[PDB]
Structure 1
């Protein structure tokens, strides 16, 4: 069946894990061409180690926010670059030798490159790099320039990144806590809270382990699938029909054996 084989191969080749393993095989081939391609397999620790993957989830949880924050930093550095290129061209000379000047803000492209490369990697901003403004008619304007750069880009715009990562840690933690709290508070199948079943000691534990075990529901589906239809009992056939019709009305929703026969049992 060549048509079915082609379809299956397309589906397989559109699969992310298979593509990752193929990339692993490709870099392993290229290692023989140049052994240092084997360093691209160290990145497999992120996919392998669950601790590393969980740590990197803090980075990737707010990934779009991080990208937008980097773009915002790029925009604001462009604004500072424009202001420098129009008013502070003299201070950007990075040559001690007077034989040749090396002014780095006589072009918008090179001044933006200089800003994005040194002003954001400097601890004090661009004023760490450029000429001292003391004894100049633009001294107050240039100290405002430098200190606003330091406040907005160095402090605020990296505090945003750190806060995004910290908030990712906290958000993932509270997501896990909320999942655990919901699971241990209400029954998965029927939704009745543990407060109802706790009237009987260990009532919720008994109900979830025995009465409404999702493992038991999975095993019953296995039983139905692997049992011949001719030998299904009445209730087995009823569930089999409801399953073939994709109607999940045989799952007890908000009701249980205890709640139904409370009058008789008590």
Structure 2
């Protein structure tokens, strides 16, 4: 019953993931009708709102829990597959823990030691003859026992622990698991205060697809945006330096004259003034300042104002908007490139749609019957489930290469029609 329940949660991960969102929209729609006299509720003459909030707050934590369980059942095995696979290939074909012994950098490499000693290291990768291969390939040049010491309704009573420390250290570094942990944490805090459910509206980004393609426009060049903001801060610093030296007296932001003076006489007040009402004014800094009607420093102040305008308000904001717009153009050009490549070339060979389109519908046969990605995947799916005794000559010629990573059996610059052009051949 436990396994059927876990398979139910794993099979229904995305549905619950989408259900939490409608729950949060409902909660935050109810929260619009809040008030004070202390943070009471006053409805439009309907007292069925408090209990709906009280139950939905519980449902949200429960569904967050079930989504975490679905993630542990469904998607964690795939990242574990990848880690075990890369570790095994590093052992065989690179010799990591025998010869290289990696840096204190590459913390994955330092963490991925205590799986080596265990029994169920290849729990998921489906290659059990790993340790035998390393004993074969390094049994004599480095050691034999030196290798072996390096390597080797009643359900809840006997299980390993050396593996399930490495495993948890992996998953707690996994990004999406940490995100769902934050989700559960905020829903748990939602009962201490029923405003913390507002933060679960940020899951629309991960949920919807096209919204992620909106926000990719900003994420594509976030580094450049941040450094532009840094440039802005530096430029404003220079302007306030000039003002603090010379133009201190114009910055009386008091009321009408013969009043006490609220002034920017320091530097740390002038800087926050400039970064708070200088960029955020639409016009610059002269809008929020006493006018220079007949001063010796008039033209210098006019230069200060319009240069602030033409360097901060116009230019750098335009740089921001341009980085966004170039992001849109770049992503579109990428997708057009992939369409052109997969319409002009076979993925495998790299031949061209001119040798084939000689014949009618040549390329749409090459990429639908002969050289399909899928039929090259199902061959591996066949070989894996098959035994090494029932292999033919072709399957064995391929299986010797797969488990030693040559890839010459894939074609390249050649095909069946190029070989046997029907020319007494």
Give the TM-score of the pair, scaled to structure 1: 0.97
Q: 1:43 to 1:249 in 2, by over 3 A?
A: same
C-alpha displacement of 1:263: 4.6
Q: Secondary structure at the match of 2:195?
A: helix
CA distance in 2, matches of 1:215, 1:101: 80
Q: 1:237 to 1:115 in 2, by over 3 A?
A: same
| Equivalent in 220, 225, 237 of residue 61 of structure 1 | 220
C-alpha displacement of 1:105: 2.7
C-alpha displacement of 1:216: 0.6
Q: 1:228 to 1:242 in 2, by over 3 A?
A: same
CA distance in 1, matches of 2:233, 2:195: 34
Q: What residue is the counterpart of 2:166 in the other structure?
A: 7
User: Do 1:69 and 1:157's aligned partners in 2 also have CA atoms closer than 8 Å?
Assistant: yes
Runs of 4+ residues deviating >2 angstroms: 97-105, 263-266
User: Do 1:58 and 1:169's aligned partners in 2 also have CA atoms closer than 8 Å?
Assistant: yes
**Is the deviation greater in 74-83 or in 99-108?**
99-108
User: Do 1:84 and 1:105's aligned partners in 2 also have CA atoms closer than 8 Å?
Assistant: no
User: Do 1:190 and 1:255's aligned partners in 2 also have CA atoms closer than 8 Å?
Assistant: yes
CA distance in 1, matches of 2:424, 2:307: 75
Instruction: State the Cα RMSD in Å.
Output: 1.3
CA distance in 2, matches of 1:20, 1:111: 40
Deviations 1:122-165 (A, max 9, x none): 10000111111122111111010000000000000100000000
Q: 1:179 to 1:197 in 2, by over 3 A?
A: same
Q: 1:31 to 1:160 in 2, by over 3 A?
A: same
Structure 1 portions without partners, runs of 5+: none
Give the TM-score of the pair, scaled to structure 2: 0.61
Structure with greater proportional helix content: 1
Structure 2 portions without partners, runs of 5+: 1-159
Instruction: Verify: 1:76 aligned to 2:235, yes or no.
Output: yes
C-alpha displacement of 1:265: 7.7
CA distance in 2, matches of 1:31, 1:177: 45
C-alpha displacement of 1:71: 0.1
CA distance in 1, matches of 2:241, 2:336: 48
C-alpha displacement of 1:81: 0.7
